[PDB]
Scaffold this active site. Structure first.
Site, PDB file in Angstrom:
ATOM      1  N   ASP A 119      48.907  43.987 -18.810  1.00  0.00           N
ATOM      2  CA  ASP A 119      50.215  43.586 -18.303  1.00  0.00           C
ATOM      3  C   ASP A 119      51.256  44.598 -18.766  1.00  0.00           C
ATOM      4  O   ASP A 119      51.496  44.749 -19.969  1.00  0.00           O
ATOM      5  CB  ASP A 119      50.590  42.182 -18.784  1.00  0.00           C
ATOM      6  CG  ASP A 119      51.905  41.685 -18.199  1.00  0.00           C
ATOM      7  OD1 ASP A 119      51.906  41.264 -17.066  1.00  0.00           O
ATOM      8  OD2 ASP A 119      52.894  41.733 -18.889  1.00  0.00           O
ATOM      9  N   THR A 156      57.385  46.072 -12.041  1.00  0.00           N
ATOM     10  CA  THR A 156      57.768  46.586 -13.350  1.00  0.00           C
ATOM     11  C   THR A 156      56.993  47.850 -13.696  1.00  0.00           C
ATOM     12  O   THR A 156      57.587  48.849 -14.119  1.00  0.00           O
ATOM     13  CB  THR A 156      57.547  45.529 -14.447  1.00  0.00           C
ATOM     14  OG1 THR A 156      58.345  44.372 -14.165  1.00  0.00           O
ATOM     15  CG2 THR A 156      57.931  46.085 -15.809  1.00  0.00           C
ATOM     16  N   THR A 157      55.671  47.829 -13.517  1.00  0.00           N
ATOM     17  CA  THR A 157      54.859  49.008 -13.802  1.00  0.00           C
ATOM     18  C   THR A 157      55.246  50.169 -12.895  1.00  0.00           C
ATOM     19  O   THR A 157      55.379  51.312 -13.354  1.00  0.00           O
ATOM     20  CB  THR A 157      53.359  48.699 -13.639  1.00  0.00           C
ATOM     21  OG1 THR A 157      52.977  47.671 -14.562  1.00  0.00           O
ATOM     22  CG2 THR A 157      52.528  49.946 -13.901  1.00  0.00           C
ATOM     23  N   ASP A 189      54.792  35.196 -10.996  1.00  0.00           N
ATOM     24  CA  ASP A 189      55.127  36.466 -10.363  1.00  0.00           C
ATOM     25  C   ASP A 189      54.974  36.413  -8.851  1.00  0.00           C
ATOM     26  O   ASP A 189      55.871  36.866  -8.132  1.00  0.00           O
ATOM     27  CB  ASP A 189      54.254  37.585 -10.937  1.00  0.00           C
ATOM     28  CG  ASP A 189      54.564  37.880 -12.390  1.00  0.00           C
ATOM     29  OD1 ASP A 189      55.586  37.368 -12.897  1.00  0.00           O
ATOM     30  OD2 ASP A 189      53.789  38.622 -13.027  1.00  0.00           O
TER      31      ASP A 189
END
Lengths: 528, 517, 521, 50, 99, 98
Positions: free
Chosen positions: B56, B89-90, B383
C-alpha cells in the site's frame, strides 16, 4: 572575565573577512529578489517543514554567529518597519556596495573615503528618484482606486493568489479604504486584521467590514442572527469576561446532596440566577452577550427559552477586537452593563461561505470602522499562509501609495536610470572620489542583473539592453522582463513602486554598508 | 562562521541536488508497488517485533522516516491526494518523482534555469490535460452501459488489493452500493461491517445498515413503525454531571434512602422522555436495569453505550438527532423506520433496519479469516467506493492500462512542435516522464517493459488510440475490449497533482533548519 | 552478451530472502520421518533441549531474518488447519525456493515464478483428491484405524485401541454429519495423576482442574444444581490506600474482626438469595478467589464452591452450562446461572477432579471434556499428547474426506503427473512446472536419507514402480525399503497433504514478492 | 482593565508597568512621591507638571 | 539557484593556467621602471645573480608549468621584434589575464 | 518495431550532438540554438543552420555554408561502421605479454 576562548579580528584582514562573510550570508537570499524568484525549505526547531520565498522569514530563520551578518538582519528590520517592499533588495544592494568596498580597499581607498563616496553618490541616486517620479492621485477617485487595484494585482501575480488576484486585490484596497479618510490620507495597517483557515480554495477569500468570531450563539436552535429590534441603534452587544453563569469551582463540586430534593434545589438556584441575569442584560439594552468562557447546559436552556443569544469562548484579544469594532468596553460583570458600554454594530449574523459549514459568526459595522478582517482561504496551510502574506504585501503597497502619491517604476527600471546618472556624474568628480562613485553605480546594477538572472535571463545581455534603451534614445520606464511581455516597458506591464520605497531602500542599504565598513575590531566571547 | 548553534544549511551548490534527489528517493518507496502485479516491501521497527508486509503506497510513504526535508515535501503532497481523492496516490508519487528525475537532467546536461523548466512543465501539463478531455468518453445515456462502466471502475481500483483475487464478487458489491445512491457522494451512507469467519467471497450487501452492537438484557426483538430518539444523558442516577458529591450517612438505611430518591428522579426522567412519542431510545451513556425496565414497560427499546460510531451510524440511517436536552417533549427531530430487528449473523447479534426514511444507505458485510484480512478488505472497498462515487457525478471515463498515459505523451510531444527552444526540452522531458508510468506497470508485471512500451508508442501514434498494456498476457490489447477504464476526474487529479508537486520542488534551492527545540 | 544493468539491486534482497529461508528449511529437513535425526538447541535463557518436533525446533530456533521467520508462520498455519505435516510443508517450501533460485538465475521474473507455481499447486491439489481413499465419519473403524496409525510413533502405542475411539466420539459429538469445518477447541482435555490409561472418560459437560470445598461441612457435591460464574473475589476488605485506625481496647479490635467476618458472610448470604447451588470462581491474582472463612460460611449455606478456576475453563463453563459471568457482587442473580444434574468431585487415587455433568437444558451447547487419568505424569502427558494428534487426524477426515498413502507416495505421483502434464504447457510455464515437479522429490529423498537408504535408489524405484501403482508404493522405515504403503498402514489424511501444497506455495509467493525492507519507527 | 475603566470614567489617566528609572524621573520632575499602598496616600505625594 | 551541475570541470585547467601565468607576471611586475626592485636568483650551479632585467630574470626563473612558460616566449618575441619593453609585455599579459 | 525503436531515436540523438558541440565551442548557449534550430528544420525552413559568429540562427544558403556531399556520406558511413565495430565487443582476452 575569561579572556581566553575569545575570537578577535582587526585591520585589513577584518575588512576582507567582514565583507566576505556578508557576501556569503547575503547570497542566501539572492534568488528571492523578483516575482519569479525561488523558494527555500525552512525546518522549524520542532521539525516542521515549510516552503517560502518570503525574505523576512528566511532572514529570520537564519540563526548565525557572524556578527557582521547580524547587521544585515537589522537592516531588513528597518526596511520592514517603514516600507515593507524592500526586505530583500536592501540586503542585495548593501552586499553589492560591500563587494565594491572590497575592491576599493584592495586598491588603497580608505574605508572612510569609501563611506563618504557612497553617501554622496546615493544623494545623486535619490535626486533622480524624485525628479523622475509621477503622481497617481493627481487624477480622480475612480482612477486612483483603479490604480491601487492595478498595483495590488501586479504584486499578487507572483503569489499563489494569482488564480484569483481580482478578489484579493479588492480585499487589499477596500481594506485600506474602510479605515482611512480621503482628506487625511493616513493609513495605519494595524487597523486591518489578517485571518484565514485551511479549506476550500483561495477563491473563497472575503473582506469583512467587522470581526469574525465563528460561533453558534451557544445552541443549534438559537436564531442565526440578532434582530434589529424594530429600528433600534443597530444591534447592541455585551462584552463580558465572566461567563453568563454563576461562578463554578476550578476542581470538583463536592457539594453534598442528600436526596433528589437538594439536587433539584441546586438546579433551581441556577435557573433562578439565570433568569435574574437575563433580566439585567436586557434592561441594559443588550441583545447578545459575548463571554470569554463557555456556558453551562442550564445557561443555554434559559438563554434559548428567553431569546437571548450568547457567544461562547471568545478569547481576550478577540473580545477587545469586538470592542474596537463596536466602540464598546470589556465589562467584568453582567451587573455593570449599561447602554454606554454596550457595543454597537449594524448586524450580528452567521455568514455562509459557499458550501462551507462553519457559517462563521460575524459582527458587521456597514460603515467606516476601526477594524476590518481579511479572511483568507486555501487548499493547504502554506497556501493560506502565502495568500495571507500576499495580502500583507499588497496592503503595504496600497498603504504607501495612499500616504505618498509619488510613484516610481522600480522593476529594474529606476535602478538603471540611477546607475546611468551616477556613472555620468562620476566622470565629473575629477579626483579620488571617482573610484567610489563608479563603484556605487556598479552596485546599483546588481539589482536589475539579479532580477534578470533569477528570471532565466542573461543578466549581462539584459542590463546592456536596458542601459542602451535609456541612454541612446531617452530615459523611460524600461525594466527587466521578469513577468513576461513582448518588450521592457514597465508601464504597459504595470510594474509600479512607491517613491518613498526606492528612496529608503538605497539610503538604508547605504547606511548598512557604512555601518559594517565603520567597524575595525570585533571581539566575540562565549555564551552563558 | 555563518550558521551555528546546531543550525544546518545546504547552500544552493548542493541544495540544487537535494531538492531533486530527496523527492526522487520518495518515488523509490512506491515505484515497485504500482499495478496489479506490483511487488511488496517489508516494514520493521527497531523492536523487530512489528514486522509487516504491504504494497500500500500510502502505508509505505507514511511508515518510512525520511531524513531529507525535500523528500518530506512530496510525501506531504501525496498525503493530500490520499485524503482528498482516495486513489491515484502511488501514481502521483511515481510521476512526481519522474518529472523531477528528468528535470534534474535539464539542470545537469541542458543548463536550463528552473524557471524555464517550470514554465515548460506548465505548458506540457495543459497539453496532457487537453488530451484527457479529448479522449474522455461518457455513457450518460443508457444507464445499462453506465453500470457496466462502474463495474470496470470497481475492478480497476480494487485490483492490487487483497480483494483482487475475488474482485469479480466485490466489484458488484461496491457497484451496487453506489448505484443504490445514484446521488450524493457522501460515503457516510455506506458502512462496512467486519465479521470473522468464512471467506471474503461470501461478503453480502445488506440494505439494512447493520450495526454491530447489541442492546438490552431482556427487550422485544422486533419493533414496527419505530420513532428513533438518541440521547447523551445519565438515566442511572440523579446528581447528573455533578462531580465529587458524597452522601454522609450514619447507616446503610440512610444510604438506601438516597437510592430511592434516585429512583424518583429516574421515574420522572423516563416519563418526560416517553412523552416525545418514541419506540426506541439510544443513549451514548450506560442504561442500568432500572431505567431499562422503565423503558421496557412502555414498549420502548433501550440502547446503551452508543459511542461515537454508534450515534453517527444510527442517527444517519434513521435521520434522528442526538438531543442533548430533554426538558420538554416534541422539541427535537425524531428518526423513523419501518422495522428494527435483532438478528444473528455468524452467531453474533446485530441490529437490522428496514424501511428507513430516505433509506438509500446500505452496508457491505465482510467475512474474513483474520483481522488483517478484514482491515485490508475494508480499506479496499473504501477506496473503490470513493472513486465510484466520483464517477456518479462525473460520467466521463478514460482508457487505462497505460493508454491514457501514452495518449497524453502524444499530445505533449505535439505541443513541443511550436514552442521556444529551452522550453521545448522541458516539454519533451514532461512527455518522457509520462511514459514512465506504463514502463513501471510492464516492469512490475515481469514483462519486457521496453518492448511493450515501445510497441504501445507505435500503436498509439499510428492511429487506433484505444490500445494499452495487457498486464496479464504481456502484450498490447484494446482497453475497451479488455475492460480497463479509469475515472476521467481521477486521471485529471493525477496529472494536476503531479505537475504541482514538481513545481513545488523545482522552486527549491536551499534547505535551512533552525536549532532544535 | 550484455543486458539490463539494474543499478539499483533489489535482487540482493531476493537472494538474501531465499538464502536465509532455505537454510532454515534445510536444517529442519533432517528431522523428517520416524527415523529422522534429533536437534540440540541452547535457548537464550541457557536451557538446552533435545527434540525432533518440527514446530518446537523452529520456535526455539530464534530466527531473526525478517523473511525466514515466515516459515514459523507456515508451520503454525499447518498446525492450525491440518495439525500434522508441520515439518513437510517447511521442507517443500525450501525446495520450491531452491527451484525459484534456479529460475531467477535463468532470468525468470519473480512475478512469473509465483504465478506459475500457483498454477502447478492447483493441479497438485486436484491430483491429491484423485488419489484419495474415501472414508465416512459415520464409520468409527475407519477413523479409529486412522488415529491409531498416526499414534504408532508414540511411546505408548498399545492403548490407542481405547484412546482412538475416545477421540472419535469426542469429535463426533461436535462434528455432526452435515458439517465440514470442525473446531477442536470445544474439546477440553483435563488430566490428573492417579489411575491408569484405561480410566479415561468422554464427558458431555465441563470438567475442571480445581478441587471442591476444602473446609469442614462443605457438601462438595450438589444435585439438580444451578451454577454461577463468579469474577469477584470473596475476601475481607483490604484497601490498597492509606488507613489510620487507633485501637485502645480489645472491644474495638473485636468489632474489626466482626467486620471481616460479617463482610464475608454478607456476600455468602447475598449469593444464596440468588438460589445458586455451585460457585465456580474465576482465578485472579488480586485477591484470593474465596477466603477460608467464606468457605465455612458458604458450607453452612449448603453451597458448593470450586475456587481458582482458570480463565480458559471459565470460557468453557459459560458456553456449555448456560451460565454467564458475574462481574460484581450486587450483580449476582438467578438469571446468570446455568444448569447441571450433578456436580461432584471425584477422588481417583487423589485426582481431586471436579465434573459438571447433565446440563438437561436448552442452553446446552456441543462442548466436550475428556477426563485423563494415569499413575505418573508421563502417563497422563502421553495420553493427552496422543489424543491431541488423534483429534487432529479425525478432524482432517471430516474436512477433506479420505486418506492418501504416505512414505512420499503422493509426492512421487504428483511429480510424475506434473512432469507429463507440463508437456502440454508452453513458454515459461512449461519450464517452471518441471521445476515444481522436481522440487516435490525433496520429501521422498529426505525420507530415504533419514531412513539409512540410498537416496537415488529409493526415489528411482518409486518412480518406476508408479508406472503400474498409484498410491501403493512408498518408503517404509519398518521394512527399510520401497514396499506396499497400505499393507504397512502408512496413511495420511488428505487435508495434511493438501495443506502442505497450498501453504508452501503461499509462502513462496510471499517470499518472492519481497524486493525491499525499510525501517519504520 | 477594570482599573483603567474605573479611572477613565473618573477622567483619570493611567500608565502602568513603568520601569523604575522612568518612574523615578517622573516623580523627580513633578515633585511627588511613590506610595506602595492606596490606604496610606498623603496629599504631599502628589506632583504637578505644566 | 540551480544551474549547470559542472560534473566535468574544464574550468579547473584554465584556472590553473591563469594562476600560473599571472604569478610569473606579478614577479616581473615589481621590477618595472628605473626605480623598480631587484630580483635575486640562486642558479642551479649555486651562483647568486641580481638583476632588474625582465628577460634575463624570466630565463633564470626556470618556470615549470607548460603554459606559464609561454610568458617567457612573449618576452623573447618582444626582444626579437622591438628589442625593448620586454618587461612590459608580460606585465600587461598578467593584468589582461586577470581581466 | 518495438525493440529497435529506441536505437533508431538514439541514432538521431547522436546526430544532433555535432551542432551542440559547435555552439558550445563558439561560446554560445547550445541548448537555445540547437533546440530552436531543430524547430526551424522541423517546421519546414530547411535552409537554416548555426551562425557561429553572431550566435544566432541563419540561412546557410545566404551565408554560403556548404559541405561536400561525398564527405558527408563518408562521415555518416564511417561513424556508423565505427560504432558497430565496438558494439559487437563484450569480451577482452589478452595473451601473455612480451
Amino acid at each position: 572575565k575569561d579572556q581566553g576562548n575569545k575570537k578577535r579580528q582587526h585591520g585589513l584582514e577584518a575588512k576582507k573577512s567582514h565583507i566576505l562573510a556578508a557576501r556569503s550570508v547575503a547570497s542566501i537570499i539572492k534568488t528571492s529578489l523578483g516575482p519569479r524568484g525561488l523558494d527555500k525549505i525552512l525546518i522549524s526547531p520542532d521539525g516542521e517543514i515549510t516552503i517560502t520565498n518570503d525574505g523576512a522569514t528566511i532572514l529570520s530563520q537564519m540563526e548565525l554567529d557572524n556578527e557582521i551578518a547580524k547587521l544585515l538582519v537589522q537592516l531588513s528590520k528597518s526596511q520592514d518597519d517603514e516600507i515593507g517592499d524592500g526586505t530583500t533588495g536592501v540586503v542585495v544592494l548593501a552586499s553589492a556596495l560591500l563587494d565594491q568596498a572590497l575592491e576599493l580597499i584592495q586598491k588603497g581607498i580608505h574605508p572612510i573615503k569609501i563611506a563618504n563616496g557612497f553617501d554622496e553618490a546615493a544623494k545623486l541616486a535619490i535626486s533622480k528618484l524624485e525628479e523622475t517620479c509621477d503622481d497617481i492621485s493627481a487624477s480622480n477617485d475612480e482612477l486612483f482606486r483603479d490604480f491601487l487595484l492595478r498595483a495590488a494585482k501586479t504584486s499578487l501575480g507572483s503569489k499563489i493568489v494569482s488564480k484569483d488576484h481580482d478578489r484579493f486585490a479588492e480585499m487589499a484596497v477596500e481594506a485600506v479604504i474602510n479605515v482611512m479618510d480621503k482628506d487625511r490620507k493616513d493609513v495605519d495597517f494595524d487597523l486591518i486584521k489578517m485571518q484565514g483557515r485551511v479549506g476550500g480554495s483561495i477563491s473563497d477569500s472575503k473582506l469583512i467590514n467587522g470581526v469574525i468570531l465563528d460561533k453558534d450563539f451557544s445552541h443549534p436552535q438559537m436564531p442565526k442572527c440578532v434582530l434589529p429590534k424594530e429600528g433600534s441603534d443597530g444591534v447592541k452587544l455585551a462584552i463580558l469576561t465572566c461567563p453568563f453563569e454563576p461562578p463554578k469551582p476550578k476542581t470538583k463540586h463536592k457539594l453534598d446532596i442528600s436526596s433528589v430534593e437538594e439536587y433539584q434545589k441546586l438546579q433551581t438556584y441556577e435557573q433562578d440566577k439565570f433568569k435574574e441575569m437575563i433580566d439585567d442584560v436586557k434592561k441594559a439594552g443588550a441583545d447578545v452577550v459575548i463571554c470569554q468562557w463557555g456556558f453551562d447546559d442550564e445557561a443555554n436552556h434559559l438563554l434559548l427559552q428567553n431569546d437571548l443569544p450568547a457567544v461562547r469562548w471568545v478569547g481576550g484579544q478577540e473580545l477587545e477586537h469586538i470592542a474596537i469594532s463596536t466602540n464598546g468596553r470589556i465589562v467584568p460583570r453582567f451587573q455593570d452593563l449599561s447602554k454606554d458600554k454596550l457595543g454597537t454594530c449594524s448586524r450580528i449574523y452567521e455568514q455562509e461561505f459557499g458550501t462551507t459549514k462553519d457559517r462563521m459568526l460575524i459582527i458587521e459595522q456597514s460603515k467606516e470602522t476601526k477594524t476590518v478582517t481579511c479572511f483568507v482561504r486555501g487548499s493547504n496551510k502554506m497556501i493560506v499562509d502565502e495568500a495571507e502574506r500576499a495580502l500583507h504585501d499588497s496592503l503595504c503597497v496600497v498603504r504607501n501609495l495612499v500616504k505618498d502619491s509619488r510613484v516610481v517604476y522600480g522593476g529594474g527600471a529606476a535602478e538603471v536610470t540611477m546607475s546611468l546618472a551616477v556613472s555620468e556624474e562620476a566622470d565629473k568628480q575629477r579626483g579620488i572620489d571617482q573610484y567610489a562613485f563608479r563603484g556605487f553605480a556598479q552596485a546599483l546594477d546588481t539589482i536589475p542583473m539579479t532580477l534578470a538572472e533569477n528570471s532565466g535571463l542573461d543578466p549581462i545581455g539584459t542590463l546592456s539592453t536596458l542601459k542602451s534603451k535609456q541612454l541612446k534614445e531617452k530615459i523611460s520606464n524600461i525594466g527587466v522582463d521578469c513577468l513576461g511581455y513582448g518588450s521592457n516597458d514597465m508601464k504597459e506591464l504595470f510594474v509600479v513602486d512607491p517613491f518613498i520605497g526606492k528612496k529608503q531602500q538605497i539610503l538604508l542599504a547605504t547606511q548598512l554598508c557604512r555601518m559594517i565598513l565603520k567597524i575595525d575590531n570585533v571581539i566575540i566571547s562565549g555564551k552563558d | 562562521q555563518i550558521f551555528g548553534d546546531q543550525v544546518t544549511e545546504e547552500r544552493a551548490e548542493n541544495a540544487r541536488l537535494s531538492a531533486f534527489v530527496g523527492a526522487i528517493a520518495v518515488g523509490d518507496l512506491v515505484k515497485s508497488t504500482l499495478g496489479p502485479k506490483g511487488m511488496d516491501k517489508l516494514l520493521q521497527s527497531a523492536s523487530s517485533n512489528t514486522c509487516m508486509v504491504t504494497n500500500d503506497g500510502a502505508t509505505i510513504l507514511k511508515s518510512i522516516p525520511l531524513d531529507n526535508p525535500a523528500a518530506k515535501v512530496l510525501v506531504n503532497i501525496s498525503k493530500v491526494q490520499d485524503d482528498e481523492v482516495g486513489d491515484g496516490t502511488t501514481s502521483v508519487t511515481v510521476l512526481s518523482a519522474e518529472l523531477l528525475r528528468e528535470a534534474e537532467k535539464l539542470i545537469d546536461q541542458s543548463k536550463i534555469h528552473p524557471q524555464t523548466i517550470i514554465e515548460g512543465y506548465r505548458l506540457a501539463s495543459a497539453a496532457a490535460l487537453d488530451a484527457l478531455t479529448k479522449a474522455a468518453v461518457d455513457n450518460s445515456h443508457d444507464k445499462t452501459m453506465f453500470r457496466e462502466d462502474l463495474i470496470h471502475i470497481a475492478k480497476t481500483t480494487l485490483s492490487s488489493k487483497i480483494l483482487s483475487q475475488d474482485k469479480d464478487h466485490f466489484a458488484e458489491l461496491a457497484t451496487n452500493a453506489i448505484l443504490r445512491l445514484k446521488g450524493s457522494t457522501n460515503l457516510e451512507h455506506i458502512q462496512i461491517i467486519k465479521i470473522l469467519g468464512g471467506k471474503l467471497s461470501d461478503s453480502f450487501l445488506d440494505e439494512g445498515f447493520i450495526l454491530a452492537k447489541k442492546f438490552g438484557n431482556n427487550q422485544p426483538k422486533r419493533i414496527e413503525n419505530a420513532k428513533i430518539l438518541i440521547a447523551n444523558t445519565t438515566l442511572d442516577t440523579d446528581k447528573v454531571k455533578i462531580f465529587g458529591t458524597k452522601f454522609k450517612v450514619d447507616s446503610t438505611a440512610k444510604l438506601a434512602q438516597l437510592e430511592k430518591a434516585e429512583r424518583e428522579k429516574m421515574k420522572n426522567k423516563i416519563a418526560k422522555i416517553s412523552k416525545f412519542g418514541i419506540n426506541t431510545f439510544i443513549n451514548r451513556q450506560l442504561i442500568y436495569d432500572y431505567p431499562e425496565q422503565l423503558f421496557t414497560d412502555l414498549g420502548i427499546n433501550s440502547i446503551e453505550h452508543a459511542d461515537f460510531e454508534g450515534v453517527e451510524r444510527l442517527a444517519l440511517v434513521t435521520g434522528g438527532e442526538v438531543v442533548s436536552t430533554f426538558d420538554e417533549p416534541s422539541k427535537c427531530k425524531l428518526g423513523e423506520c419501518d422495522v428494527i430487528e435483532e438478528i444473528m449473523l455468524g452467531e453474533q447479534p446485530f441490529l437490522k433496519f428496514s424501511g428507513c426514511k430516505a433509506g438509500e444507505a446500505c452496508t457491505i458485510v465482510l467475512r474474513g479469516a483474520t483481522d488483517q484480512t478484514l482491515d485490508e478488505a475494508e480499506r479496499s472497498l473504501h477506496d473503490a467506493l470513493s472513486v465510484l462515487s466520483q464517477t456518479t457525478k462525473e460520467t466521463r471515463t478514460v482508457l487505462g492500462g497505460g493508454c491514457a498515459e501514452m495518449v497524453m505523451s502524444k499530445a505533449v510531444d505535439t505541443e513541443a512542435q511550436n514552442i521556444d527552444g529551452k522550453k521545448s526540452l522541458a516539454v519533451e522531458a514532461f512527455a518522457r516522464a509520462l511514459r514512465q508510468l506504463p514502463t513501471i506497470l510492464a516492469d512490475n508485471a515481469g514483462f519486457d517493459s521496453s518492448e511493450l512500451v515501445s510497441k504501445l508508442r507505435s500503436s498509439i501514434y499510428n492511429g487506433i488510440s484505444t490500445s494499452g498494456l495487457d498486464l496479464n498476457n504481456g502484450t498490447i490489447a484494446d482497453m475497451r475490449q479488455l475492460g480497463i477504464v479509469e475515472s476521467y476526474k481521477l486521471k485529471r487529479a493525477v496529472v494536476s497533482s503531479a505537475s504541482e508537486a514538481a513545481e513545488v520542488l523545482l522552486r527549491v534551492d536551499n534547505i535551512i533548519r533552525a536549532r532544535p527545540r | 552478451n550484455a543486458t539490463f544493468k539494474n543499478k539499483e539491486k533489489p535482487q540482493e534482497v531476493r537472494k538474501a530472502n531465499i538464502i536465509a529461508a532455505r537454510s532454515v528449511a534445510d536444517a529442519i529437513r533432517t528431522s523428517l520421518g520416524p527415523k529422522g535425526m534429533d536437534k540440540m538447541i541452547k535457548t537464550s535463557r541457557g536451557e538446552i533441549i533435545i527434540s525432533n518436533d518440527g514446530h518446537t525446533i523452529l520456535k526455539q530456533m530464534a530466527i531473526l531474518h525478517p523473511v525466514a521467520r515466515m516459515l514459523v508462520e507456515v508451520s503454525a498455519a499447518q498446525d492450525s488447519e491440518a495439525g500434522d505435516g508441520t515439518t513437510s510443508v517447511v521442507i517443500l517450501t525450501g525446495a520450491l525456493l531452491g527451484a525459484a533460485e534456479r529460475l531467477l538465475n535463468k532470468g525468470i521474473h519473480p512475478t512469473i515464478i509465483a504465478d506459475s507455481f500457483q498454477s502447478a499447486a492447483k493441479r497438485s491439489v486436484d491430483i491429491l483428491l484423485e488419489m484419495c481413499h474415501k472414508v465416512s465419519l459415520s464409520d468409527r473403524e475407519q477413523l479409529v484405524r486412522a488415529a491409531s496409525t498416526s499414534l504408532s510413533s508414540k511411546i505408548v502405542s498399545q492403548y490407542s485401541s481405547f484412546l482412538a475411539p475416545l477421540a472419535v466420539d469426542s469429535v463426533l459429538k461436535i462434528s455432526d454429519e452435515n458439517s465440514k469445518n470442525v473446531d477442536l477447541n470445544d474439546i477440553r482435555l483435563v488430566k490428573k495423576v492417579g489411575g491408569t490409561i484405561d480410566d479415561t472418560e468422554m464427558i458431555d459437560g465441563v470438567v475442571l482442574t480445581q478441587t471442591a470445598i476444602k473446609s469442614a461441612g462443605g457438601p462438595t457435591r450438589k444435585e439438580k444444581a444451578k451454577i454461577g460464574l463468579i469474577q469477584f473475589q470473596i475476601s475481607p476488605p483490604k484497601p490498597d490506600t492509606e488507613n489510620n485506625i487507633i485501637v485502645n481496647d480489645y472491644r474495638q479490635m473485636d468489632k474489626i474482626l466482626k467486620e471481616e467476618r460479617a463482610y464475608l458472610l454478607n456476600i455468602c448470604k447475598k449469593i444464596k438469595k440468588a438460589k445458586c447451588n455451585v460457585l465456580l470462581i474465576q482465578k485472579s491474582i488480586l485477591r484470593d478467589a474465596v477466603n477460608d472463612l467464606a468457605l465455612h460460611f458458604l458450607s453452612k449455606l449448603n453451597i458448593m464452591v470450586v475456587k481458582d478456576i482458570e480463565r480458559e475453563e471459565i470460557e468453557f463453563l459459560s458456553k456449555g452450562l448456560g451460565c454467564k459471568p458475574i462481574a460484581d457482587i450486587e450483580l449476582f442473580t438467578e438469571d446468570r446461572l446455568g444448569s447441571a444434574d450433578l456436580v461432584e468431585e471425584i477422588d481417583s487415587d487423589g485426582s481431586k477432579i471436579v465434573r459438571v455433568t447433565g446440563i438437561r437444558n436448552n442452553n446446552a451447547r456441543p462442548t466436550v471434556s475428556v477426563v485423563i487419568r494415569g499413575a505418573n505424569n508421563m502417563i497422563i502427558d502421553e495420553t493427552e499428547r496422543s489424543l491431541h494428534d488423534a483429534l487432529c487426524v479425525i478432524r482432517c477426515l471430516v474436512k477433506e474426506r479420505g486418506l492418501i498413502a504416505g512414505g512420499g507416495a503422493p509426492e512421487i505421483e504428483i511429480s510424475r503427473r506434473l512432469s507429463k502434464e507440463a508437456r502440454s504447457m508452453e513458454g515459461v510455464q512449461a519450464f517452471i512446472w518441471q521445476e515444481f515437479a522436481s522440487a516435490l522429490e525433496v520429501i521422498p529423498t529426505t525420507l530415504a536419507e533419514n531412513a539409512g537408504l540410498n537416496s537415488i535408489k529409493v526415489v528411482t524405484e518409486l518412480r518406476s514402480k508408479h508406472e503400474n501403482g498409484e498410491l501403493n508404493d512408498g518408503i517404509s522405515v519398518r521394512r527399510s525399503g520401497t514396499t506396499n504403503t497400505y499393507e504397512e498402514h502408512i496413511l495420511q489424511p488428505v487435508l495434511v497433504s493438501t495443506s502442505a501444497i497450498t501453504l508452501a506455495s503461499e509462502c513462496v509467493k510471499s517470499i518472492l514478492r519481497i524486493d525491499d525492507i525499510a525501517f519504520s519507527r | 482593565d477594570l482599573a483603567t475603566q474605573f479611572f477613565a470614567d473618573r477622567n483619570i489617566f493611567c500608565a502602568g508597568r513603568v520601569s523604575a528609572d522612568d518612574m523615578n524621573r517622573v516623580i523627580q520632575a513633578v515633585g511627588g512621591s511613590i506610595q506602595s499602598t492606596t490606604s496610606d496616600i498623603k496629599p504631599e505625594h502628589l506632583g504637578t507638571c505644566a
